[PDB]
Amino acid sequence: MKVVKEFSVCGGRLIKLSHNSNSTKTSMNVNIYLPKHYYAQDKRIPTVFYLSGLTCTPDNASEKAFWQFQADKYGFAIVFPDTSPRGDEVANSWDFGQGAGFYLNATQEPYAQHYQMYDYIHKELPQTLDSHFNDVKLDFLDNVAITGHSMGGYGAICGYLKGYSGKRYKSCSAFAPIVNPSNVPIGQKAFKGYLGEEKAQWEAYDPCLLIKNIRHVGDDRILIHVGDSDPFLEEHLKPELLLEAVKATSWQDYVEIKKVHGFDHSYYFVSTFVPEHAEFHARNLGLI
Amino acid sequence: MKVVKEFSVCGGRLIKLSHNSNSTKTSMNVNIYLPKHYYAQDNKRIPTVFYLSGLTCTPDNASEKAFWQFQADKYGFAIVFPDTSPRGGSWDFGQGAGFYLNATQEPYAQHYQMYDYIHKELPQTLDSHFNKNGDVKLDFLDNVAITGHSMGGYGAICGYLKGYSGKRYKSCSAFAPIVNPSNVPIGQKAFKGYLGEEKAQWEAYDPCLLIKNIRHVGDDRILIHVGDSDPFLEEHLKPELLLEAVKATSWQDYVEIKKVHGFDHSYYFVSTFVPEHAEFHARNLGLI
Ligand SMILES: [Cu+2]
Ligand SMILES: [Cu+2]
């Protein structure tokens, strides 16, 4: 990969990266924060993958979530991927297209060409980062957490479940996730656009449908925060739907939704709860 | 004074305000964070930190990227984020670039009374809003600290010195400040535009000149951070001129400039050092 820019933050560094992606057939932008532990003289640092919401680039969470303080405190690295392929040659209002790939492998043209964000996030990007950085000093593949906000919250829960039986991610949380995009207005527009009008091809990407037949094991838990003043809550987020979907299943008591008063959708909300989630992921990654 | 929006953050609230400014004669935008202490309602009042922003910024930038809120909760202060000019071409000068001066030149004198705005009008307006529901929790006037970034770091130091006889502010710090605006390009342009080309008006606003004949009292200290990877440092900030100014002065030994390696001018630098500045302001405000 190519180092675009580095920033000193806390005891470590935020690095802006670009690389030519095979999944998307274009150049991609990725931010990573390396904690103070990476630069300490004289075992692998686990990683947290944070997926962003509609319209965001990697700079938004990097600047406004303050994960970096939490990364130094516990000893993890954190990766901020992009939300879609970008560029003049890529097909492209705020809720679909560029900045809005919904973490799916597109089948409909002209999106199919560049919109393979499911493969980009869970397959290509981790071992690309592994090639670049790795002595495995950093674990991108085995001991890894996934989290995110909104559409990113959706991507996180979706990736965790679809990989659960093979233990793909060892930890999962979300901030204001869209839990059931197949029957919600903002999720139907992306599904129709990328996957076509056949609703059966949607099913494989829908947390509420996927979770029912995944056998929960151990004390594994999904942590969700959502604010009661979130303007998207009633119409698009509908976190209730997932609590209903796990009723009478092995997952019933292991999806923890915390509805918090006064908080909205913003990074003021996110940054407030970053420390609690950081503690959550660090425990699961065996750091405390 | 009028409320525009009101987010929950950490244990408290960030309120976006607007009012008709008599000194700018325009409408003005101000963000204020109120800590968890303000909403715990079962003696001594909550003090205020005034954070002045740099060239270009609105109150929203520091509100979102500095994470003062966690520190305000930790120690028990309020924090006010004023704007950098009247609102309603060039980035050195004009809107977002008022330089915390009372402009004497036309047509600027009309609206660019930013010194009176910061130091007289705003604290009294805020006081009238939060303690003219007839009962008093905050202190915008007596127990107050001042801080800032770049142009804001200049304004903070300048305000602290000009009001030192009477202790207008009980505490002062800066992030990558412009210390000697008279001797610096971007300072000379703003000074020429607002004040004219007459030096008795210039020296009344220059900290390096002001500090020499102000009698230092007690244990008062000015805390400054700067990065060595700051692209503005070498030409425009030049923080060590302030160390030379206080040479053989009662202020010698009381100006603390921490140069930290690898940090730049960004909010990655500011936010890294906010917890230390917060502790500093907290002692001086008698909160710890
Ligand atoms: Cu490389
Ligand atoms: Cu009012």
Coordinates of C-alpha atoms and ligand atoms in Angstrom, one line a residue:
Chain A
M1 CA 0.0 0.0 0.0
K2 CA 0.9 3.7 -0.3
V3 CA 1.3 6.1 2.7
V4 CA -0.6 9.3 1.8
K5 CA -0.1 11.1 5.2
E6 CA 0.9 10.4 8.8
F7 CA -0.3 12.3 12.0
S8 CA 1.0 12.1 15.5
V9 CA -2.0 11.6 17.9
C10 CA -1.8 10.5 21.5
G11 CA 1.2 8.2 21.8
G12 CA 0.8 6.8 18.3
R13 CA -0.1 7.6 14.7
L14 CA -3.0 8.0 12.4
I15 CA -1.9 7.0 8.9
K16 CA -3.8 7.8 5.7
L17 CA -3.4 5.0 3.1
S18 CA -4.3 4.4 -0.5
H19 CA -4.1 1.2 -2.6
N20 CA -5.4 -0.2 -5.9
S21 CA -8.3 -2.6 -5.0
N22 CA -9.1 -5.8 -6.9
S23 CA -12.6 -6.1 -5.4
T24 CA -13.6 -2.6 -6.5
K25 CA -11.2 -2.2 -9.5
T26 CA -10.3 1.3 -8.2
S27 CA -8.0 3.1 -5.8
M28 CA -9.2 3.0 -2.2
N29 CA -8.7 5.3 0.8
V30 CA -8.1 3.8 4.3
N31 CA -7.1 5.2 7.7
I32 CA -5.4 3.2 10.4
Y33 CA -4.4 4.3 13.9
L34 CA -1.4 2.5 15.3
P35 CA -1.3 2.7 19.2
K36 CA 1.8 3.7 21.3
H37 CA 2.5 -0.1 21.7
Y38 CA 3.6 -0.4 18.1
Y39 CA 6.4 2.2 18.6
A40 CA 7.5 0.9 22.0
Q41 CA 11.0 -0.7 22.0
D42 CA 11.7 -4.3 23.0
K43 CA 2.2 -10.5 21.4
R44 CA 0.4 -9.3 18.3
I45 CA -1.6 -6.1 18.5
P46 CA -5.3 -7.0 17.8
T47 CA -7.3 -4.8 15.5
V48 CA -10.7 -3.2 15.6
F49 CA -12.5 -2.6 12.2
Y50 CA -14.8 0.4 12.4
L51 CA -17.3 0.8 9.5
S52 CA -18.7 4.3 8.8
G53 CA -22.2 5.4 7.8
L54 CA -23.8 7.1 4.8
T55 CA -21.8 10.0 3.3
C56 CA -18.7 9.5 5.5
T57 CA -15.0 9.1 4.5
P58 CA -12.4 7.6 6.8
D59 CA -11.4 11.1 8.1
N60 CA -14.8 11.6 9.8
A61 CA -14.5 8.9 12.4
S62 CA -10.8 9.4 12.7
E63 CA -11.3 13.0 13.7
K64 CA -14.5 12.9 15.7
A65 CA -14.7 9.6 17.6
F66 CA -11.5 9.8 19.6
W67 CA -10.8 6.0 19.4
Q68 CA -7.1 6.8 19.6
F69 CA -7.2 7.5 23.4
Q70 CA -8.9 4.1 23.8
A71 CA -6.4 2.4 21.5
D72 CA -3.4 3.5 23.6
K73 CA -5.2 2.7 26.9
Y74 CA -5.9 -1.0 25.9
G75 CA -3.3 -1.7 23.2
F76 CA -5.3 -2.2 20.0
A77 CA -5.0 -0.8 16.5
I78 CA -8.1 0.5 14.7
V79 CA -8.9 0.6 11.0
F80 CA -11.2 3.1 9.3
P81 CA -12.2 1.8 5.8
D82 CA -14.2 3.8 3.2
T83 CA -17.9 3.5 2.6
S84 CA -17.9 3.0 -1.3
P85 CA -15.6 3.0 -4.2
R86 CA -14.8 6.6 -5.3
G87 CA -13.6 8.3 -8.5
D88 CA -14.6 9.8 -11.9
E89 CA -14.8 6.3 -13.4
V90 CA -17.1 4.9 -10.7
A91 CA -20.9 5.0 -11.2
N92 CA -22.9 7.4 -9.0
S93 CA -28.6 10.8 -4.0
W94 CA -26.9 11.0 -0.5
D95 CA -28.3 7.6 0.4
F96 CA -27.2 5.6 -2.6
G97 CA -24.0 5.3 -4.7
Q98 CA -20.7 7.0 -3.7
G99 CA -20.5 7.2 0.1
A100 CA -23.3 4.6 0.2
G101 CA -22.2 1.1 -0.9
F102 CA -24.1 -0.6 2.0
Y103 CA -21.3 -3.2 2.3
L104 CA -22.7 -5.6 -0.4
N105 CA -21.4 -7.2 -3.5
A106 CA -23.4 -5.4 -6.2
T107 CA -24.9 -7.7 -9.0
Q108 CA -26.8 -5.0 -11.0
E109 CA -25.0 -3.1 -13.6
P110 CA -23.6 -0.4 -13.7
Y111 CA -22.8 -0.9 -10.0
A112 CA -21.5 -4.5 -10.2
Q113 CA -18.3 -3.2 -11.9
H114 CA -16.9 -1.4 -8.8
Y115 CA -19.3 -2.0 -5.8
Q116 CA -17.9 -5.2 -4.2
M117 CA -17.7 -3.7 -0.7
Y118 CA -18.5 -7.0 1.1
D119 CA -15.4 -8.7 -0.4
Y120 CA -13.4 -5.5 0.0
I121 CA -14.1 -5.1 3.8
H122 CA -14.0 -8.8 5.0
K123 CA -11.6 -10.4 2.5
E124 CA -9.2 -8.1 0.6
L125 CA -8.5 -5.2 2.9
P126 CA -7.4 -7.3 6.0
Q127 CA -4.7 -9.3 4.2
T128 CA -3.7 -6.2 2.1
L129 CA -3.0 -4.4 5.4
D130 CA -1.2 -7.6 6.6
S131 CA 1.1 -7.6 3.5
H132 CA 1.9 -3.9 4.1
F133 CA 2.6 -4.0 7.8
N134 CA 3.8 -7.6 8.5
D135 CA 7.1 -10.7 12.5
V136 CA 3.3 -10.4 12.8
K137 CA 3.3 -7.2 14.9
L138 CA -0.4 -6.6 14.1
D139 CA -3.2 -9.1 13.9
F140 CA -5.6 -8.3 11.0
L141 CA -6.9 -11.8 10.4
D142 CA -7.3 -13.9 13.6
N143 CA -7.9 -11.8 16.8
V144 CA -10.1 -9.0 15.3
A145 CA -13.1 -6.9 16.4
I146 CA -15.7 -5.3 14.2
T147 CA -17.9 -2.3 15.0
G148 CA -19.6 0.7 13.2
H149 CA -22.1 3.4 12.9
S150 CA -25.5 3.4 11.1
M151 CA -24.9 1.7 7.7
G152 CA -21.6 0.8 9.3
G153 CA -23.4 -0.6 12.3
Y154 CA -25.4 -2.7 9.8
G155 CA -22.2 -3.8 8.1
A156 CA -20.6 -4.8 11.4
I157 CA -23.5 -7.0 12.6
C158 CA -23.9 -8.5 9.2
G159 CA -20.2 -9.4 8.8
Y160 CA -20.1 -10.9 12.3
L161 CA -23.1 -13.2 11.8
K162 CA -22.2 -14.4 8.3
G163 CA -18.8 -15.4 9.7
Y164 CA -19.8 -16.6 13.2
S165 CA -19.5 -20.3 12.7
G166 CA -16.0 -19.9 11.5
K167 CA -15.3 -17.3 14.2
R168 CA -14.3 -14.6 11.7
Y169 CA -14.6 -11.7 14.2
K170 CA -14.0 -12.2 17.9
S171 CA -16.1 -9.2 19.0
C172 CA -19.0 -7.1 17.6
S173 CA -20.8 -3.9 18.6
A174 CA -22.8 -1.1 16.8
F175 CA -23.8 2.5 17.1
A176 CA -27.2 3.3 15.8
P177 CA -27.3 0.4 13.3
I178 CA -29.9 -0.3 10.6
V179 CA -30.8 -3.8 11.8
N180 CA -33.4 -4.8 9.1
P181 CA -32.7 -3.0 5.7
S182 CA -34.8 -5.4 3.7
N183 CA -38.0 -3.8 5.1
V184 CA -37.1 -0.2 5.7
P185 CA -37.1 2.7 3.1
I186 CA -33.4 3.6 3.1
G187 CA -32.4 -0.1 2.9
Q188 CA -34.8 -1.0 0.1
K189 CA -33.4 1.7 -2.2
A190 CA -29.8 0.2 -1.9
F191 CA -31.0 -3.4 -2.2
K192 CA -33.1 -2.8 -5.4
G193 CA -30.2 -0.7 -6.9
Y194 CA -27.3 -3.1 -6.2
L195 CA -29.0 -6.6 -5.9
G196 CA -32.0 -6.2 -8.2
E197 CA -35.7 -6.5 -7.6
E198 CA -35.7 -10.2 -6.5
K199 CA -36.2 -10.1 -2.7
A200 CA -34.7 -13.5 -2.1
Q201 CA -31.2 -12.3 -3.0
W202 CA -31.6 -9.7 -0.3
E203 CA -32.0 -12.3 2.4
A204 CA -28.3 -13.2 2.7
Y205 CA -27.5 -9.7 3.8
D206 CA -30.2 -9.2 6.4
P207 CA -29.2 -9.6 10.1
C208 CA -32.8 -10.2 11.3
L209 CA -33.1 -13.2 8.9
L210 CA -29.5 -14.5 9.2
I211 CA -29.4 -14.6 13.0
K212 CA -32.4 -17.1 13.5
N213 CA -30.5 -20.2 12.4
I214 CA -27.0 -19.2 13.6
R215 CA -26.3 -21.2 16.8
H216 CA -25.1 -18.9 19.5
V217 CA -22.4 -20.4 21.6
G218 CA -20.8 -19.4 24.9
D219 CA -21.2 -15.9 26.4
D220 CA -20.9 -14.1 23.0
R221 CA -22.8 -10.8 23.0
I222 CA -23.7 -8.1 20.5
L223 CA -23.6 -4.6 22.1
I224 CA -25.8 -1.9 20.6
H225 CA -26.2 1.7 21.5
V226 CA -29.0 3.9 20.2
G227 CA -30.2 7.3 21.3
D228 CA -33.9 8.2 21.8
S229 CA -33.6 11.5 20.0
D230 CA -32.1 9.9 16.9
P231 CA -34.1 11.3 14.0
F232 CA -33.7 8.0 12.0
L233 CA -34.8 5.7 15.0
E234 CA -38.5 5.2 14.2
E235 CA -38.4 5.0 10.5
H236 CA -35.0 3.4 9.5
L237 CA -33.1 2.0 12.5
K238 CA -35.9 0.1 14.3
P239 CA -33.7 -1.8 16.8
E240 CA -36.8 -3.5 18.2
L241 CA -36.9 -5.6 15.0
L242 CA -33.7 -7.5 16.0
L243 CA -34.9 -8.1 19.5
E244 CA -38.0 -9.6 18.1
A245 CA -36.1 -11.6 15.5
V246 CA -34.1 -13.4 18.3
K247 CA -37.1 -14.2 20.4
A248 CA -37.3 -18.0 21.0
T249 CA -33.8 -18.6 19.6
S250 CA -30.3 -19.3 21.1
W251 CA -29.5 -15.6 20.6
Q252 CA -32.4 -14.4 22.7
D253 CA -30.6 -13.1 25.8
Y254 CA -27.4 -12.2 23.9
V255 CA -28.3 -9.1 21.9
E256 CA -27.9 -6.1 24.2
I257 CA -29.6 -2.9 23.0
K258 CA -29.1 0.2 25.2
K259 CA -31.4 3.1 24.4
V260 CA -29.9 6.3 25.7
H261 CA -31.9 9.4 26.5
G262 CA -31.3 12.7 24.7
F263 CA -28.7 11.4 22.4
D264 CA -29.0 11.7 18.6
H265 CA -27.3 10.2 15.5
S266 CA -24.2 12.3 15.6
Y267 CA -20.5 11.8 16.5
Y268 CA -21.3 13.5 19.8
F269 CA -23.4 10.4 20.5
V270 CA -20.7 8.0 19.1
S271 CA -17.7 9.6 20.9
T272 CA -19.6 9.5 24.2
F273 CA -19.9 5.7 24.0
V274 CA -16.5 4.9 22.3
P275 CA -14.9 4.2 25.8
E276 CA -17.6 1.7 26.9
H277 CA -17.3 -0.1 23.5
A278 CA -13.5 0.1 23.7
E279 CA -13.7 -1.7 27.1
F280 CA -16.1 -4.2 25.5
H281 CA -13.9 -5.1 22.6
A282 CA -10.6 -5.1 24.6
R283 CA -12.1 -7.7 27.0
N284 CA -13.2 -9.9 24.1
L285 CA -9.8 -9.5 22.4
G286 CA -8.1 -10.7 25.6
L287 CA -6.4 -7.4 26.5
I288 CA -8.0 -7.1 29.9
Chain B
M1 CA -30.2 34.9 23.7
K2 CA -31.8 32.0 21.7
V3 CA -31.3 28.2 21.6
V4 CA -30.8 26.7 18.1
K5 CA -29.9 23.0 18.8
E6 CA -29.2 21.0 22.0
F7 CA -27.2 17.7 21.9
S8 CA -26.6 15.4 24.8
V9 CA -22.8 14.7 25.0
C10 CA -20.9 12.8 27.7
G11 CA -22.8 13.6 31.0
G12 CA -24.1 17.0 29.8
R13 CA -25.3 19.1 26.9
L14 CA -23.8 21.0 24.0
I15 CA -26.0 24.0 23.2
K16 CA -25.7 25.9 20.0
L17 CA -26.8 29.5 20.5
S18 CA -27.5 32.7 18.5
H19 CA -28.0 36.3 19.6
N20 CA -28.1 39.8 18.3
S21 CA -24.6 41.1 19.1
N22 CA -24.6 44.8 20.0
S23 CA -20.8 45.0 19.5
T24 CA -20.8 43.3 16.1
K25 CA -24.3 44.6 15.3
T26 CA -24.8 41.2 13.6
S27 CA -26.3 37.9 14.6
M28 CA -23.6 35.7 16.3
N29 CA -23.2 31.9 16.8
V30 CA -21.8 30.4 20.0
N31 CA -21.5 26.8 21.2
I32 CA -21.4 26.1 25.0
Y33 CA -20.9 22.7 26.7
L34 CA -22.5 22.3 30.1
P35 CA -21.0 19.5 32.2
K36 CA -22.8 16.8 34.1
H37 CA -22.4 19.1 37.2
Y38 CA -24.9 21.5 35.8
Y39 CA -27.7 18.9 35.7
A40 CA -26.9 17.3 39.0
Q41 CA -29.3 19.4 41.2
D42 CA -29.0 18.8 44.9
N43 CA -22.7 26.4 46.9
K44 CA -19.7 27.4 44.8
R45 CA -20.5 28.0 41.1
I46 CA -19.3 26.2 37.9
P47 CA -16.5 28.2 36.3
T48 CA -16.0 28.7 32.6
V49 CA -13.2 28.2 30.1
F50 CA -13.3 30.4 27.0
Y51 CA -11.8 28.6 24.0
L52 CA -10.9 30.8 21.0
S53 CA -10.6 29.1 17.6
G54 CA -8.2 29.8 14.8
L55 CA -8.4 31.3 11.3
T56 CA -11.2 29.9 9.2
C57 CA -13.1 28.0 12.0
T58 CA -16.6 28.2 13.3
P59 CA -17.4 27.1 16.9
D60 CA -18.4 23.7 15.5
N61 CA -14.8 22.6 14.6
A62 CA -13.3 22.6 18.1
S63 CA -16.6 21.4 19.5
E64 CA -16.4 18.2 17.4
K65 CA -12.6 17.6 17.2
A66 CA -11.0 18.6 20.5
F67 CA -13.1 16.5 22.9
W68 CA -13.1 19.1 25.8
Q69 CA -16.4 17.7 26.9
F70 CA -14.9 14.6 28.6
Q71 CA -12.5 17.0 30.4
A72 CA -15.3 19.4 31.4
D73 CA -17.1 16.5 33.0
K74 CA -13.9 15.2 34.6
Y75 CA -13.2 18.5 36.5
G76 CA -16.5 20.5 36.5
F77 CA -16.2 23.4 34.2
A78 CA -18.3 24.8 31.4
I79 CA -16.6 25.6 28.1
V80 CA -17.6 28.3 25.6
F81 CA -16.7 28.2 21.8
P82 CA -17.2 31.7 20.3
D83 CA -17.0 32.4 16.6
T84 CA -14.0 34.0 14.9
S85 CA -15.8 37.0 13.3
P86 CA -19.1 38.6 12.5
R87 CA -21.1 36.7 9.7
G88 CA -23.7 37.7 7.1
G89 CA -12.1 36.5 -0.9
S90 CA -9.2 36.1 1.5
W91 CA -8.7 33.7 4.4
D92 CA -6.0 35.8 6.2
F93 CA -8.5 38.5 6.6
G94 CA -12.3 39.2 7.0
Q95 CA -14.8 36.5 8.0
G96 CA -13.4 33.8 10.2
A97 CA -10.4 36.1 10.7
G98 CA -11.4 38.9 13.1
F99 CA -8.2 38.5 15.1
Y100 CA -9.9 39.3 18.4
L101 CA -9.4 43.1 17.7
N102 CA -11.6 46.2 18.0
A103 CA -11.3 47.5 14.5
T104 CA -11.0 51.3 14.2
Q105 CA -10.9 51.4 10.3
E106 CA -14.0 51.8 8.1
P107 CA -16.1 49.9 7.0
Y108 CA -14.9 47.3 9.6
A109 CA -15.4 49.4 12.9
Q110 CA -19.1 48.9 12.2
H111 CA -19.0 45.2 13.0
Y112 CA -15.5 44.0 13.9
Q113 CA -15.5 44.9 17.6
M114 CA -14.3 41.4 18.4
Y115 CA -12.3 42.3 21.5
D116 CA -15.3 43.8 23.2
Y117 CA -17.4 40.9 21.9
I118 CA -15.2 38.2 23.5
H119 CA -14.3 40.0 26.7
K120 CA -17.3 42.1 27.6
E121 CA -20.5 41.4 25.6
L122 CA -20.5 37.6 25.3
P123 CA -19.8 36.8 29.0
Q124 CA -22.5 39.2 30.2
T125 CA -25.0 38.0 27.5
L126 CA -24.4 34.3 28.6
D127 CA -24.7 35.3 32.3
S128 CA -28.0 37.0 31.5
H129 CA -29.3 33.8 29.8
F130 CA -28.1 31.1 32.3
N131 CA -28.4 33.1 35.5
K132 CA -31.4 35.3 34.5
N133 CA -33.8 32.5 35.0
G134 CA -33.1 34.2 38.3
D135 CA -30.9 31.5 39.9
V136 CA -27.2 31.1 39.5
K137 CA -25.1 28.1 38.7
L138 CA -22.4 29.3 36.3
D139 CA -19.7 31.9 36.4
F140 CA -18.9 33.7 33.1
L141 CA -17.3 36.7 34.8
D142 CA -15.1 36.1 37.9
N143 CA -13.7 32.6 38.0
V144 CA -12.8 32.2 34.3
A145 CA -10.0 30.8 32.2
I146 CA -9.0 31.5 28.6
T147 CA -7.4 29.3 25.9
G148 CA -7.1 28.8 22.2
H149 CA -5.5 27.6 19.0
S150 CA -3.4 29.6 16.5
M151 CA -5.2 33.0 16.1
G152 CA -7.2 31.9 19.1
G153 CA -4.0 31.1 21.1
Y154 CA -3.0 34.7 20.3
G155 CA -6.3 36.1 21.5
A156 CA -6.1 34.2 24.7
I157 CA -2.7 35.3 25.7
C158 CA -3.4 38.9 24.6
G159 CA -6.7 39.0 26.6
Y160 CA -5.0 37.5 29.6
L161 CA -2.2 40.1 29.6
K162 CA -4.3 43.2 28.9
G163 CA -6.6 42.2 31.7
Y164 CA -3.9 40.9 34.1
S165 CA -4.1 43.9 36.5
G166 CA -7.4 42.9 38.0
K167 CA -7.0 39.3 36.9
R168 CA -9.6 39.3 34.1
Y169 CA -8.8 35.7 33.5
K170 CA -7.6 33.4 36.3
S171 CA -5.9 31.0 33.8
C172 CA -4.4 31.1 30.3
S173 CA -3.0 28.5 27.8
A174 CA -2.5 28.1 24.1
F175 CA -2.2 25.6 21.3
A176 CA 0.3 26.7 18.5
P177 CA -0.3 30.4 19.1
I178 CA 0.8 33.4 17.1
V179 CA 2.8 35.2 19.8
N180 CA 4.2 38.4 18.0
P181 CA 1.5 39.4 15.4
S182 CA 3.2 42.7 14.7
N183 CA 6.3 40.9 13.4
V184 CA 4.4 38.3 11.4
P185 CA 2.9 38.5 7.8
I186 CA -0.6 37.3 8.5
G187 CA -0.6 39.4 11.6
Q188 CA 0.6 42.6 9.9
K189 CA -2.2 42.3 7.2
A190 CA -5.0 42.0 9.8
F191 CA -3.4 44.7 12.0
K192 CA -3.1 47.0 9.0
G193 CA -6.7 46.3 7.7
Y194 CA -8.5 46.7 11.1
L195 CA -6.3 49.2 13.0
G196 CA -4.5 51.1 10.3
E197 CA -0.8 51.7 9.9
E198 CA -0.2 53.3 13.3
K199 CA 1.9 51.5 15.9
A200 CA 0.5 52.8 19.2
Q201 CA -2.7 51.0 18.2
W202 CA -0.6 47.9 17.3
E203 CA 1.5 47.6 20.4
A204 CA -1.7 47.6 22.6
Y205 CA -2.5 44.2 21.0
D206 CA 1.0 42.6 20.9
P207 CA 1.7 40.1 23.8
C208 CA 5.6 40.3 23.3
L209 CA 5.4 44.1 23.9
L210 CA 2.6 44.0 26.5
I211 CA 4.3 41.5 28.8
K212 CA 7.4 43.5 29.5
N213 CA 5.8 46.1 31.8
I214 CA 3.1 43.9 33.4
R215 CA 4.2 43.0 36.9
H216 CA 3.9 39.2 37.4
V217 CA 2.1 38.2 40.6
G218 CA 2.2 35.0 42.7
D219 CA 2.6 31.7 40.8
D220 CA 0.8 32.6 37.5
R221 CA 2.0 30.6 34.5
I222 CA 1.3 30.6 30.8
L223 CA 1.2 27.1 29.3
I224 CA 1.9 26.7 25.5
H225 CA 2.1 23.6 23.4
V226 CA 3.6 23.5 19.8
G227 CA 4.5 20.9 17.3
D228 CA 7.8 20.8 15.4
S229 CA 6.0 19.4 12.3
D230 CA 3.7 22.5 12.2
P231 CA 4.0 24.0 8.7
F232 CA 3.0 27.5 10.1
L233 CA 5.5 27.4 13.0
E234 CA 8.7 28.7 11.4
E235 CA 7.2 31.8 9.7
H236 CA 4.0 32.8 11.5
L237 CA 3.8 31.2 15.0
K238 CA 7.4 31.6 16.1
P239 CA 6.5 30.9 19.8
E240 CA 10.0 31.3 21.2
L241 CA 10.0 35.1 20.6
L242 CA 7.7 35.2 23.7
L243 CA 10.5 33.5 25.7
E244 CA 12.8 36.3 24.5
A245 CA 10.3 39.0 25.3
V246 CA 10.1 37.9 29.0
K247 CA 13.9 37.8 29.3
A248 CA 15.0 39.9 32.4
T249 CA 11.3 40.4 33.1
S250 CA 9.2 39.5 36.2
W251 CA 7.5 37.1 33.7
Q252 CA 10.7 35.1 33.0
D253 CA 10.4 31.5 34.3
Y254 CA 6.6 31.8 34.1
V255 CA 6.0 31.1 30.4
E256 CA 6.1 27.4 29.7
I257 CA 6.6 26.3 26.1
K258 CA 6.4 22.6 25.5
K259 CA 7.6 21.7 22.0
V260 CA 6.5 18.2 21.2
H261 CA 8.1 16.3 18.3
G262 CA 6.1 15.0 15.4
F263 CA 2.9 16.9 16.0
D264 CA 1.5 19.3 13.5
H265 CA -1.1 22.2 13.6
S266 CA -4.2 20.0 13.4
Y267 CA -6.8 18.9 15.9
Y268 CA -4.9 15.6 16.2
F269 CA -2.4 17.8 18.0
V270 CA -4.9 19.9 20.0
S271 CA -7.0 16.9 21.2
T272 CA -3.9 15.0 22.3
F273 CA -3.0 17.8 24.7
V274 CA -6.5 18.9 25.8
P275 CA -6.4 16.6 28.9
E276 CA -3.2 18.2 30.2
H277 CA -4.5 21.8 29.5
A278 CA -7.7 20.8 31.3
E279 CA -5.9 19.7 34.4
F280 CA -3.9 23.0 34.3
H281 CA -7.0 25.2 34.0
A282 CA -8.7 23.1 36.7
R283 CA -6.0 23.8 39.3
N284 CA -6.0 27.5 38.5
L285 CA -9.8 27.6 38.7
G286 CA -9.5 25.8 42.1
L287 CA -11.5 22.8 41.0
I288 CA -8.6 20.5 42.1
Ligands
CU1 CU 2.4 -1.3 1.0
CU2 CU -31.6 34.1 26.5

